[PDB]
Amino acid sequence: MNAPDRFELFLLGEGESKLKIDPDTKAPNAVVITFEKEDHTLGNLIRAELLNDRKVLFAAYKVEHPFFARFKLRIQTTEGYDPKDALKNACNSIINKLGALKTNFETEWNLQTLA
Amino acid sequence: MIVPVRCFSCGKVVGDKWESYLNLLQEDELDEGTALSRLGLKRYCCRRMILTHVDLIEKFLRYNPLEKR
Amino acid sequence: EGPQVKIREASKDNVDFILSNVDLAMANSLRRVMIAEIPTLAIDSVEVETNTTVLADEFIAHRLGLIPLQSMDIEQLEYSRDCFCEDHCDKCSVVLTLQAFGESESTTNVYSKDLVIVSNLMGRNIGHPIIQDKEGNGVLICKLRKGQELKLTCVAKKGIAKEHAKWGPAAAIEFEYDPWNKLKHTDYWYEQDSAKEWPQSKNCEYEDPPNEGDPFDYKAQADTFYMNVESVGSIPVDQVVVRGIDTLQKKVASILLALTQM
Amino acid sequence: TLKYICAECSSKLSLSRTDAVRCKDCGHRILLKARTKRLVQFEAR
Amino acid sequence: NQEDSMIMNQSSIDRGLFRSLFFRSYMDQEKKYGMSITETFEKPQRTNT
Ligand SMILES: [Zn+2]
Ligand SMILES: [Zn+2]
Ligand SMILES: [Zn+2]
């Protein structure tokens, strides 16, 4: 009756965007990015790759409610480093690592004879 | 009622392993555990999916059809 | 250079491998994507013409929706939500037809081998129900007494496990790391001795046991994940892993695209 | 007219408003209306 | 799952766990209000009802 449609978990609704960035007034050079129609699958990956960066002072994410598929990611970097640049670098590193992993898995699977 | 298509927990397809299970139980006189292991059900989720099923559909089939063609 | 993979066992429906030189978050994200985000074909709509059986119409519809279908070329199909047709067409769906009649004095078993593809697949490799057993009969869909009939049509659209678990191609995914608990990520419950009461995992043979006198290594991170992917049958298990990696990469690329475009 | 099935003979009959509800084959007084001809749609979820 | 709540697996529900059929029956008779005041099962028309 009140159960929402399952495609609402991954399909963007009308009038909303995937990302929205709002500055944080608690600390200098900090932003909060709301990701819509996403969950821990992307949030944990992005947070870990951000923490791998050396100029990122703070990086965390939270899913405020399991009912809704969205999460908030707070990023604070050192002076003179744009948090959006940190997000770009994290995403680029993730893509490169995943591409290398796909290549390695394909090469390893090509070596099988009992498949 | 009738054998479930997939294991509820993991999702392994078990709807094609019911007649084989019955044949193993009857023709080969295998016990339930060995028959389950033979069909490839190693996780106990699938094992409880196939082991505890009650085939009530046979009872339903005993009654004469309401609309017979 | 990057994440390194070594595979132990390869089968038609299982692949058991090691995923080394990689973060825990990446491995868990890959596992979650394999569970949920891989597109697959499955029957979505059922038009029932005749059902004189002992099962309810939606019961049979649910059973049909749980039938695994071939999805090797699922990437060539389009989602029904973003297709220009009215309800279903050939660019975004596959039409099957189940027509069974109980003309035998004994019970007649309606399997999934009786599902017949009607829509022209246009040379794709989708639609065929997956047959695994040696007998050749697929999933036992229904049973018929003499004189009972079951006529129905099915429309199959592509979907992912997030919308409904019937689209999940990945079954159970074994995922373990650090078999010797050298990272101390767990505190073992025990009564007398933790080592005796907890059986050693099969992966313990692939790592050096701790020396029991060395100090705790606080700088060590988590890597070398032992993962075993099982395939329902819709796509080969190696394709399951590859498409999971591809889908995760697509998600991150879409994040980059949205960031750049805004 | 409208179609019904004898609850025992499982035979098909056509009944009008003035027809007494009985099965001409056996005389059974219980009849079940026939399945509708309009298509029925089910979500396989 | 606090205070006797439970967490159920949604994927398990999707595959048929604890799914149920529910039947409800409505009975209706025509009664002889008089010698020729018998009720009649029919499709009522807004013109004369
Ligand atoms: Zn299972
Ligand atoms: Zn279409
Ligand atoms: Zn009769």
UniProtKB/Swiss-Prot annotation, chain A:
Record localization: Nucleus
Molecular function terms from GO: DNA binding; DNA-directed RNA polymerase activity; protein dimerization activity
The GO cellular component terms are: nucleus; RNA polymerase II, core complex
**Sorted alphabetically, which keywords does the UniProt record give?**
DNA-directed RNA polymerase, Nucleus, Transcription
Tell me the disulfide pairings in this chain. none
Q: List this protein's GO terms for biological process.
A: RNA-templated transcription; termination of RNA polymerase II transcription; transcription by RNA polymerase II; transcription elongation by RNA polymerase II; transcription initiation at RNA polymerase II promoter
Q: Which CDD domains match?
A: RNAP_II_RPB11
Q: Record keywords: Chloroplast included?
A: no
Give the top-rank taxon of the lineage listed in the UniProt record for this protein: Eukaryota
Q: What is the effect of changing residue 114 to P?
A: Transcript termination readthrough
Q: Remarks, anything else? A: Present with 4280 molecules/cell in log phase SD medium.
What is the protein's known function? DNA-dependent RNA polymerase catalyzes the transcription of DNA into RNA using the four ribonucleoside triphosphates as substrates. Component of RNA polymerase II which synthesizes mRNA precursors and many functional non-coding RNAs. Pol II is the central component of the basal RNA polymerase II transcription machinery. It is composed of mobile elements that move relative to each other. RPB11 is part of the core element with the central large cleft. Seems to be involved transcript termination.
Membership in a protein family? Belongs to the archaeal Rpo11/eukaryotic RPB11/RPC19 RNA polymerase subunit family.
Binding partners and assembly: Component of the RNA polymerase II (Pol II) complex consisting of 12 subunits.
State what protein this is by name. DNA-directed RNA polymerase II subunit RPB11
Swiss-Prot record, chain B:
Write the record's keywords in alphabetical order, separated by commas: DNA-directed RNA polymerase, Isopeptide bond, Metal-binding, Nucleus, Ribosome biogenesis, Transcription, Ubl conjugation, Zinc
Q: What is the lineage of its organism?
A: Eukaryota, Fungi, Dikarya, Ascomycota, Saccharomycotina
Q: Which GO terms describe its biological process?
A: nucleolar large rRNA transcription by RNA polymerase I; ribosome biogenesis; RNA-templated transcription; termination of RNA polymerase I transcription; termination of RNA polymerase III transcription; transcription by RNA polymerase I; transcription by RNA polymerase II; transcription by RNA polymerase III
Q: Crosslinked positions for Glycyl lysine isopeptide (Lys-Gly) (interchain with G-Cter in ubiquitin)?
A: 59
Q: Which SUPFAM superfamilies match?
A: RNA polymerase subunit RPB10
Protein name (Swiss-Prot/TrEMBL): DNA-directed RNA polymerases I, II, and III subunit RPABC5
Coiled-coil positions are: none
Q: What does this protein do?
A: DNA-dependent RNA polymerases catalyze the transcription of DNA into RNA using the four ribonucleoside triphosphates as substrates. Common component of RNA polymerases I, II and III which synthesize ribosomal RNA precursors, mRNA precursors and many functional non-coding RNAs, and a small RNAs, such as 5S rRNA and tRNAs, respectively. Pol II is the central component of the basal RNA polymerase II transcription machinery. Pols are composed of mobile elements that move relative to each other. In Pol II, RBP10 is part of the core element with the central large cleft.
Q: Name one Pfam family in it.
A: RNA_pol_N
Record-annotated disulphide pairs: none
Q: What else is known?
A: Present with 5300 molecules/cell in log phase SD medium.
Q: Which Gene3D superfamilies match?
A: Homeodomain-like (1.10.10.60)
Swiss-Prot record, chain D:
- What are the boundaries of the C4-type zinc fingers? 6-26
* Modifications made to the protein after synthesis: The N-terminus is blocked.
The gene coding this protein: RPC10
Protein name in UniProt: DNA-directed RNA polymerases I, II, and III subunit RPABC4
Keyword Nucleus set for record = yes
Q: Sorted alphabetically, which keywords does the UniProt record give? A: DNA-directed RNA polymerase, Metal-binding, Nucleus, Peroxisome, Ribosome biogenesis, Transcription, Zinc, Zinc-finger
Similarity field: Belongs to the archaeal Rpo12/eukaryotic RPC10 RNA polymerase subunit family.
Annotated Zn(2+) binding lies at 6, 9, 23, 26
Organism this protein belongs to: Saccharomyces cerevisiae (strain ATCC 204508 / S288c) (Baker's yeast)
Covered residues of the complete protein? 26 to 70 of 70
One MF term from GO for this chain?
DNA binding
From Swiss-Prot, chain E:
* Entry binding sites for Mg(2+): 4
Coiled-coil regions listed in the entry = none
Q: Where in the cell is it found?
A: Nucleus
Other remarks in the entry: The binding of ribonucleoside triphosphate to the RNA polymerase II transcribing complex probably involves a two-step mechanism. The initial binding seems to occur at the entry (E) site and involves a magnesium ion coordinated by three conserved aspartate residues of the two largest RNA Pol II subunits.
Give the protein's function: DNA-dependent RNA polymerase catalyzes the transcription of DNA into RNA using the four ribonucleoside triphosphates as substrates. Second largest component of RNA polymerases II which synthesizes mRNA precursors and many functional non-coding RNAs. Proposed to contribute to the polymerase catalytic activity and forms the polymerase active center together with the largest subunit. Pol II is the central component of the basal RNA polymerase II transcription machinery.
**Family membership noted in the UniProt record:** Belongs to the RNA polymerase beta chain family.
Subunit-structure text = Component of the RNA polymerase II (Pol II) complex consisting of 12 subunits.
Q: What is this protein called?
A: DNA-directed RNA polymerase II subunit RPB2
Q: Which organism is it from?
A: Saccharomyces cerevisiae (strain ATCC 204508 / S288c) (Baker's yeast)
What range of the intact protein is shown?
834 to 882 of 1224
